Assembly symmetry: C3
Homo-oligomer: 213 residues x 3
């Protein structure tokens, strides 16, 4: 299948996993500022657009780390081989959003073909989930482009066993020499530590700072 059954008895965080999944169920959010000065220059010298690039770069970082691709399936801890981004789409006419997903690809050009195509087919589709059920192997990416925020947190009544990372971006802004993007990351404590979140962000910063292709 497109996942592997994870070895829970020989894993180093096995005590942690049960602690934060059942004894003390919890998660955490942290918002950090990502330096997008270099990425703006690269976007500038290409035909790619900001949102799709951020989706692609977020999914790329997510797909490099096992702990951000965890889930429970048939009462077992699995690791997705790969995850596809589920992102929000604003409808300026209705002032409502839809949530769309498209296959992740390592090739940035193929990713762009996927995004545009799905963006093509459901552009004016105001259902909350135009495509139907959300793929099991997903990551959530949202965007708040109209306002800059220093912090964002989702207060959820019931989060038992939902391990997919929640990522939210705000409007970027010039802070002296740098163009900074606020990025909120919300994770479940059973599968992720502060280290795992820092790693992802640091990795995401690297990617912003590198050639697109």
């Amino acid at each position: 299948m497109n996942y592997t059954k994870f070895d829970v008895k020989n894993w180093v965080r096995r005590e942690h996993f049960e602690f934060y999944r059942h004894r003390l169920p919890c998660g955490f959010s942290l918002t950090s500022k990502i330096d997008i000065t270099t990425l703006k220059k690269s976007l500038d010298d290409s035909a790619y657009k900001f949102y799709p690039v951020m989706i692609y770069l977020i999914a790329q970082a997510v797909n490099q780390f096992d702990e951000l691709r965890m889930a429970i399936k048939d009462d077992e801890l699995i690791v997705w081989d790969s995850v596809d981004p589920q992102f929000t789409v604003f409808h300026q006419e209705t002032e409502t959003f839809s949530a769309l997903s498209c296959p992740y690809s390592s090739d940035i050009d193929q990713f762009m073909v996927n995004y545009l195509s799905v963006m093509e087919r459901y552009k004016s589709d105001t259902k909350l989930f135009p495509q139907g059920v959300t793929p099991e192997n997903h990551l959530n990416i949202a965007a708040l482009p109209w306002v800059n925020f220093d912090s964002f947190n989702l207060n959820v009544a019931n989060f038992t066993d939902y391990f997919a990372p929640i990522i939210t971006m705000a409007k970027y802004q010039q802070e002296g020499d740098r163009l900074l993007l606020p990025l909120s990351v919300q994770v479940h404590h059973a599968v992720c530590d502060g280290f795992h979140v820092a790693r992802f962000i640091n990795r995401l910063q690297e990617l912003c700072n590198s050639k697109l292709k």
Copy 2:
């Protein structure tokens, strides 16, 4: 009455409303910095005081948007025609707070008469709710004037169907050329999207930037 029964079957966010009210109950908070450089100048050239002005400006923005005045009454979704601010009051002697409310008025001078009068009557009243029950048509405004914060979030055990926006301000501070006020907004996802929150903040920023009268 002072409210209108909202048309839920012909509303564009009807799927959203049920999704986030029952399938996935949740809310979110975001803290943004409001530029109060212009407002400080206007306060300077008047006799008005900062807290009352912020209460008045917050209630004014809130009263312009339907989605921030929503509630459930007799198991139905209503929109308040208008809402009155319920704000916190610090008692320096006891080191405790009370929560007071006063009628909103479009006329800033009449608002000030209301605030001073209620502030007059319950100045030394250390009950948590001096006035009695909190009016159904309300908004919550709190202030933390002793410390600046980049983020604030209320972790509530049970928030089912409480749709009134929660607004919290921190101590303002000079960030170069600007006087910035941290403002945390906490809302329920059933009635508000990220767009609706951005709109409010952008509108609030406009108001700070305009004549008081």
Copy 3:
């Protein structure tokens, strides 16, 4: 014993206490930036290290205020005479953390002897709680040294009657003339108001700004 039964009927926040402990159970988090320019200079001129100093200074501020040392014991509200820090320890080999605690002492040198000794004994102990049960009189201190954050919030499924403050620090960073440390404080509303949190932070800032000995 090492605690005193608190006088709930003659306390000024008694209505507040029941309100936020049972009628409206909730807490809040706030992240503020602590100016550590002065502390860096003092660390520089000594042999002490940053994490241990921050633990010591956090526990010192906490031990000055009753409301941050509250608990329920045998269904009664107690105040700990004193609390010991429980802090996280990263294991670079396994990439997992443990939580350790050591006795608080007013003497900074004795504190350092305690920390090093416990750090000595369980350096390579990868259990989540190497020492066993966590002392009842504790405070939680965590650190995220790999990334800077503007906000941090723990989303906990069940927090009834746990009154110990949760403090989390991020990687510090140069913001012009200042070295700023992000510090998230998470508290239960029954025992702490915004005032009580501001007071702690202001007190913590003072301590950073003062001689170590």
